[PDB]
C-alpha cells in the first residue's frame, strides 16, 4: 500500500545502476504532455499520441533528459491512420530544447516537420527526422550539430510521403560534422551522392533514390566506411509491389571500376535492385575485408555462370544473388561458375529466383569444398526435378532451403520484393541439419527418395500434396530425424504404424491435414503414437477430427499435444462415452490445447479422463456456456487454465476448493457480471489472473482478499463495466494504491457510470463525498 | 397508424383463405403462456420455451385451436442445452385439452413426459410424443385415440435418452385404432414387431431398435403399407459415430423369405444397417410396385456380383447399396452382376463404399441400357484409376459422382453414418450433365483426360491437387462446359490464356487457390477474363491476393465477381495508384463482393474506379473505421450497400445527398452511437435499412421522416443501447404504434437504462409520467 498513488498516465521505471528514470507514455491518447513528469526523468517517450506542439514549457523542469522520443505525433497522411488524421503539422517553438544540456538522442520522426529544428543542444549525438517533409539540406541548418554522430533523414520524399521535387543537398553540407558516423538519406528522391562527406563515416545509406551515376570520386575520402547501401537506384521493376520507375534506356546504376578504391574497411556492400548486368572484378581490387554482398534483383543470370569478381572475395561470409533471372526465360539448369569455389569463407549463399527446371548434383560442385558453408537457399526457382540424395555432399550445412519450388517424383514473407525492408514503424533449425522442401509438389513419397540422407535432423514437407497412407516404410533412411513438419498435406492415418520408422522423432506436426478427416466413414488410427518412443510434441491442429476408429491415444513420452481446430464436440457427443479417455494414457502429457473444438459444454467424464500430469490446458474459443469448476479437482497438477473467448457467466464460489495448484487463470472475453463472494479466498498459489473484457460491475474485498492480490504478478481488469458509486470505495482505493501490475489503467480501466463518472478512469476517481 | 399496440411476444399472422390465425411464440424465453392470445387462434406454437405446466387455464378461451405445437419445453438432458437444463418434467393437469373440440394436431415432443397424456379430444388426427420418457404402451392408454391417423412415439428409449429397459407394447395395443396410417416407433429399444397392427397402416417405422427376427406373419394383414423401415436392427457397427451393439455371432436381422408377401402396395423398403449377407429373391415375389430400396451398410459385397433379386424389381427408381464392403478388403475392381440390366425403371444408383482400386468401362456395362438412369454415385470408393472417357456411354445421366476417391493420372455430409438422419430438431446440377471429381488426387490435367466428354455442362474438380500453369490447352474437348468448379487447387495464373478454351463457360470458381498468391515475386495474370466471352460469374474468394502483374481485369460479359478473402488493402496501399481501376473495365459488372479484404479505409480513387453498372457492393468484414459517404455519388446505379461487421461510428448527414439510387443499406454490427439529425430526409428510394447491433442510444423524429419510413420493407433496430428517458418519448411511442416491419421487438429491442427500465422491452415501456 503506496501513500502517494501514481496518477501519471505513463509507465515509470527506475534503473538505479545507470541513474536512469524512464518515463514511457507510448500510445496513451495524449493531446498534451502530461503534468507531473518526474524532475529526474532521463528517458521520455511520447511516441504515438496527438500532441500538437512543443514549447519551452514542454520540458522546463526536465533538465536531466538524455533522450526524448517524440515519434509519430503527426504522421504523413498516407502512412497514418485515416480515421484519426493529424489536422496540422507538429509546431516546435524556439528554445524548446536548448536548456536540455544533457540531451544525447532526439527522435522526431513522423511529425510532418518542414525544417531541421534549430536550437538543439551541443550534447546531441543522435537526431532522427525520418518521415517528415524536409527535402532541402543546407549547411547553415547543420551548424548546430557539430557533435552529431547519427543522422537519420530518410523517408522525407517518396511515394508514401511525396515532396514533388528532387531532394537538394548543398555542396559540403555535411563535411564539418566531424564526428558523424551514420548517415541515412534513403527513400528521399536524391539525384547525386552528396559530396564531400566527412571521413569519419562508418555507414552510409543512399538506397531507394534516383542516383543514376556514381562519380569516381564520390567515396574517395571514406576510409572508415563499413556499410554502404546504394540499392534501389535504377531499380528492377518487374512485379514490384510499389510504384517503380526504372532508369531510362534500361541502364544500370553506373558505377566506375575504381569507385570503391578508397573503401578499405568496407564490410557490407548492398547493390540490390540496381539493374546491373555485369559485376566488374576491378570493383573489388582494394576491398579485401568485404563480408556481405547483396546483388539480388539485378539482371545477373549470365554473370552467375562467369563471375570472375568472386576471386577477389576470399573473406565473404554472405552472398545474395536472388532474383536475377532473365524475363521470360525458364532455364534447363543452373550454371554456377567455378569461381564460386574461391569463396573460402562463405557461410550463406542465396540464389532464389534464378528460375530453372532441373537441379543436378554436378551443378553444385563448385560449392563442394566451401568448408564454412552453412546455408544454401535455392527457394522460389520453379525446380521440377531434384534428386535429394545429392545433399549427402552437404552434411556440414545447417539449412538446405528448396522452399517454394515444383519438386515431384528465417526471412520475412516479403523480403526481396518489398520497398524498404528496414523501414521503422511507429522453427526447426535448432535441431540441426534441415532440409526444407515446404511448398513443393511432392504427391507420393518412398524410402528411396531419402537415400543417403540419414544425417538429417529436420525435414520440412509442409504444403506439399502428399495424399498417401503411411505404413512405416516411407522414411526408413531418416534414422536421426528429430523434427518432421508434415503440415498442410493429406495424411491418411489408416495405419497405426505411420511414422514408426522415425525412431528418433521428438516433434511431429500433422496440422492442417483435414482432408481424409472431413469425409464420413473413413478409418483413422489416432493411436499411432504408441510406437514413437521419444516423441515429445505432437501437433494435430485444424484437422477437423470428429471420429476415430481407436478410442485411446497412447504414449509414454509425449509432453505436448496441440489438438486445436477439431470436433471434440462430436466425439464427446452427450450420451456417447466411448472417447472420454482419448488422452488419458498420454501419461507424461503436461500441455493440452483443445481450444476451438466447438465445445459449448464439457460432458462429465472429460476431466476424469485427463492424464494425471496435465499442467497447461487451453479450452479457449469454444463457445463454452457453462463449466463445473469443481471438476478441476481431478486435475491435480494444473497450473495454467485458459478459458478465454467463451461465454462463461460465473466464477467458482471458491477457487481454492477447485484447484490447489492453479497459478494462471485466464478468463478474458467472457460474460462474467459479478464475482462470487469468496472467489479468491486462500488461493495463495495464484499468480496471474485475467478478467478483462467481461461485464463486471462491482468487486468487493471478500472476493479479492488483499493477501492474494498483493501476490499477483498481473491482474487484468480492463474493458469491464465498473459502476463507480459509493459501493465501489474499496475497489477504487485498492486500484489507486496497489503495486500489483494492472495494465491499461491509463486507458481502459474506466467507469461506465453513474452519469458524472461515465468514461472516467478509475485511477482519477475522487470519491470524498462518500466519506463526508 | 395503430390505436392498439401489439404487446404479445408472439408473431401473429392471418391466412384468411383457410380461416387460420397463426400465433408463433417459438423461442421467446417464455416461462408461462402469455396472456392476450387471440380468441380466434387456430395454430399456436410454443416450441422452445420453459413453460413448466399445462392446465385448463392454458388454452381456456382458445376453443378454435386446430393445432398446438408445444415441443421442447423440457428436453431430455443429453439432447438439451447444458447451460439452461430443464429442472422438472412438463406437468399436464387433467382436462387441459378436452375442451379443444376442433384440435387436429398436438405436438408434445421433448417434454420428459412419463405417459401418454389422457383426456385428448376425439377430433385429434396427429399426436407426436418423440423424445419423452414413455416406454410402455398399453391398450387402455390408447382408447382415447379412436380417430388418430399419425402417431410418433420414437426416441423414448435410446442412447441420447435412455430408459434402461426394453420397450413394451401390449399385444394388439394398436389394433383398434382403425384410422391409423402412420406409426413410428424408432429409436425405442423395441425387441419385437408389435402385433396385430391395424390394416389401415401406410407407413411403419421400426428402425434403430433391437429386433433380432421378423416372424413370418409380422406384416400379414398390412395390405395398404407403402413404407416400411426396419433399418438399424442388427446394425453394422464398423466406424459407427454412435454407441453401437451388434446382434451376436455376426447375425443379420432374420427375415423369412415370405415376410413381405402381404405388402402388395409397398413402395419403399429400407433395410439399412441390418448386417445382411444375402438378399433372397423370394422376398420380392409379390411386390411389383417397389420404387425405393435401401440396402446400405450391410455385408452385401459378394451379393452385388450375383443379385438375382434385381430381376423382381422392374419398377425400382432408387437403389442404394453403399457401404457394403468386406472389412480389411481392398478389391481390384467392381463386380456388378448382369442382373442390374433388368432394372428398367432405375433413376438413381448409389454404390459408395464398395472400396476398390480400379474402375473400368466394362464393369459398368450392365448399366449401359438403363434408359432412365439419371444419377450414378460411386463416391468414397478409394478408386485410384479411372478413364473418364468411359462416361461417353452415359450422356443421358444428370450426375456422375466420383467424389472422394483417389483418382490420379446433394446428400448431407453425415448421411450413411449418422444414427438417425430423419431426427427432428427443436450447386451446378441445373446447368445439365455433371461430372463430379471433387476430393480426388488429380495433380496434373491434359486435354486427352477429357476425350469424348464434350457433352458435359458442369465439371467439379474442387479439392484436387492441381498445381499447374493452365495455358488454354488442358480442357480442349469440353466444348459445352458451362460451369467449372476449380476451387481448392493450386492454380498458377502465369498465363492470361488460362481457361480460354472453355468457350461456353458461364461460371468459374477459382476460390481457395491461394498457394501461388502466398509467395512473393510470382507473376499472376488477373486479366485472364478478357478471353471468356460468355462468362457471367467469377469466384475468386480466399486467394490471399495481394499483388497482380496486370493492372486491370477485363470483360464484356461478367456480371458477378466474388473477391472476398483477399488483400485489396495491400494492392491499394495508400500512395500506390496502380490498381485503383482493377475492376473498372468489367463493364457489365453488377455485383461485387470485396468483403474480408482488411480494408480499414478506402483510398480515394476506389469509388471512381468502380465499373459503371455496379448495383450490389459488399464491403463487409473489413475492419472499416471510416467512410466518406459522399463518394457514393460515383456509383450511379448502386442499389445494395453492405457495410456490415465493420467499425463505423457515423452515418451520413443526408443519405439522399450521397446516393439517389440506394435502396438497401446494411449497417449492422458497427459502432454507431447516434444518427445524424436529418439522416433519412428525402431518401425516397430507400427500401431496407439495417441498424442492428450498433450502440445507438436515442433516435429523434427528424432522422426518420414518415414519408421515408412508409416505403420501408424492413427497418432493423435490435441489439442497440436505447436509453428510455423522457427524451425518448417520440421513439418509444413511434415503435409501439408503427406498421413498419421491425424484427425482434419481443426479444431484442430493449432499454439498457435508466436503472428501473434496464432489460425492459421498449414495446412494453410506459412513459405516462413524462406527460403528467
Ligand atoms: C535512455 O537514453 C539513452 C540515450 O539515448 C540510451 O542510450 C543508448 O543505449 C544503448 C544500450 O542498450 C547503446 O548501445 C546506445 O548506443 C546508447 N546511446 C547513447 C547515445 O548513449 C538508453 O538506452 C535509453 N534507455 C531506454 C529508453 O531505456
Ligand atoms: C521526385 O522528383 C521529381 C523531379 O525530379 C518529381 O517529379 C516532378 O513532379 C511534378 C508534380 O508531380 C511534375 O509536374 C513535374 O513534371 C515532375 N518533374 C519531373 C522532372 O519528373 C517527383 O514527384 C519527385 N518524387 C516524389 C515522390 O516526390
Ligand atoms: C435397452 O434395454 C436393455 C434391456 O433389454 C437395457 O440393458 C439393461 O440395462 C440395465 C441397467 O443398465 C442392466 O443392469 C442390464 O444388465 C441390461 N440388460 C441387458 C440384457 O443388456 C438397456 O439399458 C436399454 N437401452 C437404453 C438406451 O435404455
Ligand atoms: C469406406 C472406407 O472404410 C474404411 C477405410 N478407411 C480407409 C482409409 N482411411 N484409407 C484407405 C486407403 C486406401 C484404401 C482403403 C482405405 C480405407 N478404408 C477401406 C478399408 C478396406 C477398410 O481399408
Ligand atoms: C521468380 C518468378 O517470377 C515470374 C514467374 N512467375 C511464374 C509462375 N507464376 N509460374 C511459373 C511456372 C513455371 C515456370 C516459371 C513460372 C514463373 N515465373 C518465372 C518466369 C520466367 C517469368 O516465367
Ligand atoms: C555457363 O555460363 C557461361 C557464361 O559465362 C557459359 O560460357 C557456359 O557455356 C555455361 N555452361 C552451361 C553448361 O550452360
Ligand atoms: C539419386 O541419387 C542417388 C545417388 O546419390 C542414386 O542412388 C539414385 O539412383 C538417384 N535416383 C534417381 C531416381 O535417379
Ligand atoms: C516449414 O515451412 C513452413 C512453410 O514454409 C513454415 O511456416 C514452417 O514454420 C516450417 N516448419 C518448421 C518446423 O520450421
Ligand atoms: C508398406 O508399404 C510399402 C509399399 O509402399 C510396402 O513395401 C510394404 O510391404 C508395406 N509394409 C507393411 C508392413 O505392410
Ligand atoms: C489401435 O487401435 C485399435 C485399438 O483401440 C486396434 O485396432 C489397433 O490394433 C491398435 N494399434 C495400436 C498400435 O495400438
Ligand atoms: C395449422 O394446423 C393445421 C392442422 O394441423 C395444419 O394442416 C396447418 O398447416 C397449420 N398451419 C400452419 C401455418 O402451421
Ligand atoms: C463376380 O461376383 C460373383 C460372386 O458373388 C461371382 O459369382 C462372379 O463369377 C464374379 N464375376 C466376375 C465377372 O468377376
Ligand atoms: C480412355 O478410353 C478411350 C476410349 O474411350 C481411349 O481413346 C483412350 O486410349 C483411353 N485413355 C487411356 C489413357 O488409357
Ligand atoms: C463441388 O464439390 C464440392 C464438394 O466436394 C462442393 O462443396 C461444391 O459445392 C461442388 N460444386 C458445385 C458447383 O456444385
Ligand atoms: C500449352 O501447354 C501444352 C502442354 O503443356 C503444350 O502442348 C503447348 O505447347 C502450350 N501452348 C502454348 C501456346 O505454349
Ligand atoms: C494481360 O496483362 C499484360 C500487361 O500487364 C499483357 O502482357 C497481357 O497480354 C494481357 N493479356 C490480356 C488477355 O489482356
Ligand atoms: C447535395 O446537396 C446540395 C445542396 O442541396 C446540392 O447542391 C448537391 O448538388 C447535392 N448533391 C447530390 C449528388 O445530390
Q: What is the DSSP string of B665-697?
A: EE--SS------TTTTTT-TT--EEE--SS---
Tell me the chain A residues in contact with residue B406 when contact means C-beta distances shorter than 8 Å.
467
Backbone angles phi, psi at B632, to 5 degrees: -60, -20
User: How far apart are alpha carbons B352 and B382 in whole angstroms?
Assistant: 10
Handedness of CA B119, B125, B130, B136 (dihedral sign): positive
Secondary structure tally for chain B: helices H, strands E:
5, 39
Helix (H, G, I), strand (E, B) or coil at A360: coil
Contact B520 A570 (CB under 8 A): no
Class of domain A1-772 as given by CATH: alpha beta
Extract the C-alpha cell encoding A658. 477447485
Query: Of the bound ligands, which one is closest to the alpha carbon of residue A156?
Result: 2
The CA distances from residue B221 to B179, B196, B200, B259, B264, in Å, are: 15, 8, 9, 11, 11
Instruction: Report yes or no: A638 and A619 within 8 Å, Cβ to Cβ.
Output: no
Buried b (16+ CB within 10 A) or exposed e, B486-506: bbbbbbbbbebebbbbbeebb
Nearest to B150 by CA among B97, B227, B90: B227
Tell me which residue of A761, A770, A772, A771 sits closest to A5, measured CA to CA.
A761
In order of A201, A706, A738, the CA distances from A2 in angstroms are 50, 14, 7
Cα(A196)–Cα(A175) distance, rounded to whole angstroms?
6
d(CA A470, CA A491): 8
The C-alpha cell of A721 is what?
Answer: 463495466
Give the separation between CA B613 and CA B507, rounded to whole angstroms: 20
H/E element holding B304? helix B301-304
CB B217 within 8 A of CB B203: no
Q: Mapping DSSP to helix (H, G, I), strand (E, B) and coil, where does residue A715 land? A: strand
Per-residue buried b or exposed e for A237-256, using 16+ beta carbons within 10 Å of the residue's own CB: ebbbbbebeebeeeebbebb
Ligand nearest to the backbone CA of B325: 4
Q: CB–CB of A73/A49 below 8 Å?
A: yes
Q: Is the CB of A389 under 6 A from ligand 7?
A: yes
- Dihedral sign of CA atoms A250, A252, A253, A257 in order: negative
Q: Could you give phi then psi for residue B406, rounded to 5 degrees?
A: -120, 30
A139 is in an annotated binding site: no
Compute the distance between CA of residue B538 and CA of residue B509 in angstroms, rounded to an integer. Answer: 6
d(CA A244, CA B316): 69
In the structure grid, which three cell numbers stand for residue A199, read together? 571521413
Q: What does A522-555 look like in DSSP terms, one character per residue?
A: ----GGGGGG-TT--EEE-TT------SSS--EE
How far is A670 from A691, CA to CA, in rounded Å?
8
Q: How far apart are CA B670 and CA B655, in angstroms?
A: 17
Which contacts qualify for A44-47: CB closer than 8 Å, 24 or more apart? A44/A68, A44/A69, A45/A69, A46/A70, A46/A73, A47/A71, A47/A72, A47/A73, A47/A107, A47/A426
Instruction: Give strand ranges (E) for A326-430.
Output: 331-333, 348-350, 356-359, 375-377, 385-386, 399-401
Q: Which three cell numbers, joined as nine digits, stand for B323?
A: 457401404
List strand residue ranges (DSSP E) for B80-166, in order: 91-92, 105-107, 126-128, 136-137, 150-152
DSSP annotation string for A153-191: --SSSBTTB--SS--EE-TTTTTT-TT--EEE--SS---
Count Cβ atoms within 10 A of the Cβ of residue B278 and give its class: 0-12 exposed, 13-18 middle, 19 or more buried: middle
Cell of B632: 457514393
CA distance linking residue A723 with residue A714, whole number of Å: 22
Q: Are strands A203-205 and A182-184 parallel, antiparallel or unpaired?
A: parallel
Contact B263, B287 (CB under 8 A): yes
Buried/exposed code over A209-223 (b: 16+ C-beta within 10 A; e: otherwise): bbbebbeeebbbbbe
> Considering only CA atoms, which of A474, A548, A462, A468 is closest in space to residue B406?
A468
CA distances from A319 to A297, A316, B388 (A): 13, 7, 51
Cα–chain-centroid distance for residue B753? 39
Residues from chain B that touch A625, judged by Cβ atoms under 8 A, are: 81-83
* Chain B residue with minimum CA distance to A414: B520
Take atom 14 of ligand 16 and give the residue whose Cα is closest: B527
Looking at residue A707, what DSSP letter applies?
A: H
| Nearest Cβ partner for A520 among B417, B522, B575 | B417
Contact A607, A635 (CB under 8 A): yes
Pick from A380, A415, A521: CB nearest B417: A521
- Short-list B444, B325, B380, CA closest to A492: B380
Are residues A476 and A453 in contact, defined by beta-carbon separation less than 8 angstroms? no
> Is the Cα torsion angle B501, B503, B504, B507 positive or negative in sign?
positive
| CA B360 and chain centroid, separation | 35
Cis, peptide link before residue A593, omega less than 30° from 0: no
Under DSSP, the state recorded for B716 is: E
Contact B589, B559 (CB under 8 A): yes
Tell how strand B11-15 and strand B20-24 pair up: antiparallel
Residues contacting residue A32 through CB under 8 Å, at least 6 positions apart: A51
Resolution limit, Å? 2.2
How far apart are the C-alpha atoms of A603 and A631, rounded to whole Å?
11
Least Cα separation, residue B416 to chain A (angstroms): 8
Cβ A515–B239 below 8 Å, yes or no? Answer: no
Whether B406 has a binding-site annotation, put simply, is yes
- Which among B86, B95, B50, B99 is positioned nearest to B70, based on CA atoms? B50
Q: Does A323 sit within 8 Å of B239, measured CB to CB?
A: no
Q: How far apart are the C-alpha atoms of B443 and A2, rounded to whole Å?
A: 69
Q: Which of B413, B570, B578 sits opposite A243 (nearest CB)?
A: B578
User: Which residues does chain A have within 8 Å of residue B404's beta carbon, measured at their own beta carbons?
Assistant: 519
Cell of residue A173, nine digits: 553540407
Cell numbers representing residue B683 in the block = 431518401
The Cα B126–Cα B151 span in angstroms is 6
- Do the beta carbons of residue A535 and residue A513 sit within 8 Å? no
Left if phi > 0, otherwise alpha if psi is -120 to 50, otherwise beta: which for A500?
A: alpha
Please tell me the distance from the alpha carbon of residue A235 to that of residue A246, in angstroms, as a whole number. Answer: 5
Cα(A234)–Cα(A253) distance, integer angstroms: 5
φ, ψ dihedrals at A430, nearest 5°: -65, -15
**What residue's CA is closest to ligand 9, atom 8?**
A473
Element (H, E) at A731: helix A729-737
Question: Helix/strand/coil (H, E, C) string of B536-583?
Answer: CEEECCCCCCCCCCCCCCEECCCCEEECCCCCHHHHCCCCCCCCCCCC
Cell triple for residue B121? 379430444
Report the distance separating Cα A219 and Cα A226, nearest Å.
Answer: 12
**Residues of chain A found within 8 Å of residue B464, distances taken between Cβ atoms:** none
How far apart (Å, rounded) are the C-alpha atoms in residues A524 and B163? 32
CB atoms inside a 10 Å sphere around CB A674: 17
Residue A761 contacts residue A746 (beta carbons within 8 Å)? yes
Cβ A552 vs Cβ A582: under 8 Å: yes
Taking phi over 0 as left and psi of -120 to 50 as alpha, with beta for the rest, B645 belongs to left
Residue to substitute in B359, B389, B445 for testing ligand 13 pocket (most ligand atoms within 8 angstroms of CB): B389
Distances from the Cα of B197 to the Cα of B94, B177, B203, B579, angstroms: 29, 9, 11, 74
Name the β-bridge partners of B447: none
| Separation of alpha carbons A148 and A104, rounded Å | 9
> Do residues A307 and A339 touch, judged by C-beta distance below 8 A?
yes
Q: Is the dihedral angle over the CA atoms A718, A723, A727, A729 positive or is it negative?
A: positive
- The sign of the CA dihedral A514, A518, A524, A529 is positive
CA–CA separation, B107 and B69 (whole Å):
5
Helix (H) / strand (E) containing A737: helix A729-737
Burial of A39 (0-12, 13-18, 19+ CB in 10 A): exposed
Amino acid at each position: 500500500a503506496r501513500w502517494f498513488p501514481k496518477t501519471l498516465p505513463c509507465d515509470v521505471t527506475l534503473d538505479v545502476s545507470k541513474n536512469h528514470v524512464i518515463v514511457d507514455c507510448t500510445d496513451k491518447h495524449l493531446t498534451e504532455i502530461p503534468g507531473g513528469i518526474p524532475t529526474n526523468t532521463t528517458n521520455l517517450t511520447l511516441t504515438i499520441n496527438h500532441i500538437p506542439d512543443i514549447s519551452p514549457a514542454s520540458f522546463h523542469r526536465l533538465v536531466h533528459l538524455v533522450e526524448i522520443d517524440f515519434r509519430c505525433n503527426c504522421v504523413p497522411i498516407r502512412l497514418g491512420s485515416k480515421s484519426n488524421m493529424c489536422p496540422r503539422r507538429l509546431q516546435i517553438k524556439p528554445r524548446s530544447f536548448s536548456g536540455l544540456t544533457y540531451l544525447k538522442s532526439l527522435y522526431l520522426d513522423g511529425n510532418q516537420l518542414l525544417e531541421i529544428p534549430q536550437g538543439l543542444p551541443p550534447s546531441l549525438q543522435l537526431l532522427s527526422l525520418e518521415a517528415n517533409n524536409i527535402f532541402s539540406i543546407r549547411k547553415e541548418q547543420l551548424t548546430e550539430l557539430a557533435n552529431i554522430e547519427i543522422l537519420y533523414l530518410g523517408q522525407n520524399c517518396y511515394y508514401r510521403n511525396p515532396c514533388y521535387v528532387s531532394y537538394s543537398i548543398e555542396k559540403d553540407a555535411f563535411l564539418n560534422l566531424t564526428k558523424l558516423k551514420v548517415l541515412s538519406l534513403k527513400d528521399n528522391n536524391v539525384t547525386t551522392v552528396p559530396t564531400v562527406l566527412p571521413s569519419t563515416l562508418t555507414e552510409l545509406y543512399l538506397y531507394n533514390n534516383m542516383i543514376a551515376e556514381i562519380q569516381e570520386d564520390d567515396f574517395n575520402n571514406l576510409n572508415q566506411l563499413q556499410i554502404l547501401d546504394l540499392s534501389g537506384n535504377c531499380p528492377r521493376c518487374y512485379n514490384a509491389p510499389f510504384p517503380c520507375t526504372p532508369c531510362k534506356n534500361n541502364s544500370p546504376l553506373q558505377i566506375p571500376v575504381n569507385a570503391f578504391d578508397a573503401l578499405t574497411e568496407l564490410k557490407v556492400l548492398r547493390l540490390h535492385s540496381n539493374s546491373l548486368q555485369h559485376v566488374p572484378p576491378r570493383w573489388f581490387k582494394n576491398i579485401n575485408n568485404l563480408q556481405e554482398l547483396d546483388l539480388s534483383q539485378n539482371f545477373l543470370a549470365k554473370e552467375i555462370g562467369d563471375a570472375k569478381f568472386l576471386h577477389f572475395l576470399p573473406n565473404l561470409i554472405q552472398l545474395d544473388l536472388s532474383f536475377n533471372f532473365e524475363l521470360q526465360v525458364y532455364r534447363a539448369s543452373m550454371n554456377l561458375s567455378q569461381a564460386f569455389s574461391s569463396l573460402k569463407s562463405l557461410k550463406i549463399l542465396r540464389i532464389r529466383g534464378y528460375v530453372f527446371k532441373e537441379l543436378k548434383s554436378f551443378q553444385l560442385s563448385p560449392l563442394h569444398n566451401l568448408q564454412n558453408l552453412e546455408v544454401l537457399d535455392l527457394g522460389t526457382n520453379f525446380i521440377k526435378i531434384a534428386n535429394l540424395s545429392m545433399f549427402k555432399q552437404f552434411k556440414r550445412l545447417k539449412v538446405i532451403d528448396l522452399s517454394v519450388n515444383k519438386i515431384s517424383p528465417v526471412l520475412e514473407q516479403l523480403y526481396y520484393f518489398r520497398y524498404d525492408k528496414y523501414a521503422r514503424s511507429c522453427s526447426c533449425y535448432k535441431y540441426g541439419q534441415t532440409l526444407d522442401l515446404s511448398k513443393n509438389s511432392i504427391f507420393f513419397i518412398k524410402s528411396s527418395d531419402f537415400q543417403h540422407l540419414s544425417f538429417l535432423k529436420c525435414l520440412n514437407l509442409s504444403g506439399n500434396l502428399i495424399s498417401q497412407t503411411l505404413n512405416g516404410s516411407e522414411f526408413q533412411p531418416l534414422a536421426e530425424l528429430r523434427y518432421l513438419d508434415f503440415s498442410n498435406n493429406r495424411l491418411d492415418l489408416l495405419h497405426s504404424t505411420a511414422f514408426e520408422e522415425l525412431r528418433k522423432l521428438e516433434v511431429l506436426d500433422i496440422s492442417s491435414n483435414s482432408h481424409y478427416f472431413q469425409s464420413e466413414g473413413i478409418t483413422h488410427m489416432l493411436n499411432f503414437t504408441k510406437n514413437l518412443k521419444v516423441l515429445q510434441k505432437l501437433m494435430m491442429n485444424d484437422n477437423d477430427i470428429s471420429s476415430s476408429t481407436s478410442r485411446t491415444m497412447e504414449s509414454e513420452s509425449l509432453r505436448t499435444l496441440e489438438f486445436r481446430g477439431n470436433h471434440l464436440d462430436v466425439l464427446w457427443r452427450d450420451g456417447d462415452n466411448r472417447y472420454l479417455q482419448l488422452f488419458k494414457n498420454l501419461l507424461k502429457l503436461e500441455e493440452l490445447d483443445i481450444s476451438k473444438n466447438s465445445l459449448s459444454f464439457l460432458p462429465s467424464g472429460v476431466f476424469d479422463g485427463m492424464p494425471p500430469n496435465l499442467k497447461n490446458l487451453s479450452l479457449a474459443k469454444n463457445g463454452l456456456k457453462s463449466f463445473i469448476w469443481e471438476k478441476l479437482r481431478y486435475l491435480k497438477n494444473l497450473e495454467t487454465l485458459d478459458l478465454s473467448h467463451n461465454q462463461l457467466t460465473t466464477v467458482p464460489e471458491r477457487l481454492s476448493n477447485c484447484s490447489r495448484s492453479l497459478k494462471n487463470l485466464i478468463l478474458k472475453n467472457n460474460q462474467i457480471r459479478s464475482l462470487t463472494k469468496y472467489f479468491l479466498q486462500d488461493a495463495f498459489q495464484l499468480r496471474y489472473l485475467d478478467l478483462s473484457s467481461n461485464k463486471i460491475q462491482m468487486i468487493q474485498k471478500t472476493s479479492f482478499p488483499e493477501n492474494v492480490l498483493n501476490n499477483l504478478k498481473m491482474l487484468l481488469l480492463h474493458h469491464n463495466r465498473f459502476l463507480c458509486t459509493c459501493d465501489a470505495v474499496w475497489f477504487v482505493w485498492w486500484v489507486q494504491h496497489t503495486e500489483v501490475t494492472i495494465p491499461y489503467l491509463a486507458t481502459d480501466v474506466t467507469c461506465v457510470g453513474p452519469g458524472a463518472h461515465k468514461g472516467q478512469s478509475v485511477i482519477s476517481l475522487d470519491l470524498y463525498t462518500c466519506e463526508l
